Structures are given as C-alpha cells and as structure tokens.
C-alpha cells in the first residue's frame, strides 16, 4: 500500500530464506533456489528448477563469494521493477 | 504478499504521481513533493521552511533535467531498503 510497507516486505521476504542457515545475512545456493521457487516462479526463471539455479547464482553473485547478500538481491529486484515498468 | 506484488506496488506508486501532468514517465518537482509528503510523513507539523523536495532533487536528478525518471526514483528506493535492513 505505502512505499515503506513494500520495502519492509522485501526485507522480510529476503530474511525468510536467508536466515534458514548459519549465514543469516546472505542467501546460499539452496536458499536462493527455495526463494526462486516460491516468491517468483515461472514468472521469472521459467524454472527447469533443478537445472538453471547455477546460472542465476552467478548473475547475482557479483563479488563471487558463493553467497547473495541483500545488496546483490536488491540489484535484481530493481532490475525486474525497471523491466516490468514497461506499461 | 509476494515479491512481485511489492515490485508492482512500487511501479504503480511512481505512476500515480508521474502522470498528473503531460510528462507521464517522470516526476516533476510538484509531483515529487506530493509523493514525499504522502509516503514519508513528517508528523510534527512544524515548518522551519522544510525543503524535502529541493534537497532530494539535487540528489536524485542525475542528468539535471529537473525531472525524476523511474531509474532515478528506484535509486531512492534502493537506498531506503539498505538503510532499513540495518534497522529491522
Ligand atoms: Ca544463508
Ligand atoms: Ca556475493
Ligand atoms: Ca510527470
Ligand atoms: Ca532526471
């Protein structure tokens, strides 16, 4: 409804999957896959979900530490936003 | 709510304010001012002249065309998300 509510929702969404393990401020490969399978599905990755998790991990992981922090997550979120904006 | 609903909410929020004039795809100074007032509410109705729009305009208007496009707007949203991720 409000801009702030949406932002908190994005934050809580990320933490739901990131805090699944020891590394609570980042998404592991499996946690991302979990996220990619629920919150946005055939919408985005067109999931052959057992197959194309790896390519997406490498797209987002721009510092190459095998984990997806919130910033890297956000960059993807706002790319989709920027992309969907087309009417 | 899903992520995709929140993304579209942010998109439609920008649109409802950007289309109040003939420049549908950008936010004017007036349109921007109303967005900031509604979305970021200064409860203390005390104005030592509050220019939230002018200071924001300088920060957000990268190309200096005195309009805020969606990408420029998303920069604001990006910063807020990062900040409140520390608050939680
Ligand atoms: Ca994790
Ligand atoms: Ca990383
Ligand atoms: Ca406009
Ligand atoms: Ca501009």
UniProtKB/Swiss-Prot annotation, chain A:
It is found in: Cytoplasmic granule. It comes from Homo sapiens (Human). Filaggrin is initially synthesized as a large, insoluble, highly phosphorylated precursor containing many tandem copies of 324 AA, which are not separated by large linker sequences. During terminal differentiation it is dephosphorylated and proteolytically cleaved. The N-terminal of the mature protein is heterogeneous, and is blocked by the formation of pyroglutamate. Undergoes deimination of some arginine residues (citrullination). It is linked to Ichthyosis vulgaris: The most common form of ichthyosis inherited as an autosomal dominant trait. It is characterized by palmar hyperlinearity, keratosis pilaris and a fine scale that is most prominent over the lower abdomen, arms, and legs. Ichthyosis vulgaris is characterized histologically by absent or reduced keratohyalin granules in the epidermis and mild hyperkeratosis. The disease can be associated with frequent asthma, eczema or hay fever. Belongs to the S100-fused protein family. Induction: In cultured foreskin fibroblasts, up-regulated in response to Ca(2+) stimulation. This is Filaggrin. Residues 5-42, 48-83 form the EF-hand domain. Ca(2+) binds at residues 61, 63, 65, 67, 72. The chain holds residues 2 to 88 of 4061 of the full protein.
């Amino acid at each position: 409804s409000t801009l702030l509510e949406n932002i908190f929702a994005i934050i809580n969404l990320f933490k739901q999957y990131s805090k699944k393990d020891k590394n609570t401020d980042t998404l592991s490969k499996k946690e991302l896959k979990e996220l990619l399978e629920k919150e946005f599905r055939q919408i985005l990755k067109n999931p052959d979900d057992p197959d194309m998790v790896d390519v997406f991990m490498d797209h987002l992981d721009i510092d190459h530490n095998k984990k997806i922090d919130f910033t890297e997550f956000l960059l993807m979120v706002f790319k989709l936003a920027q992309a969907y904006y087309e009417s």
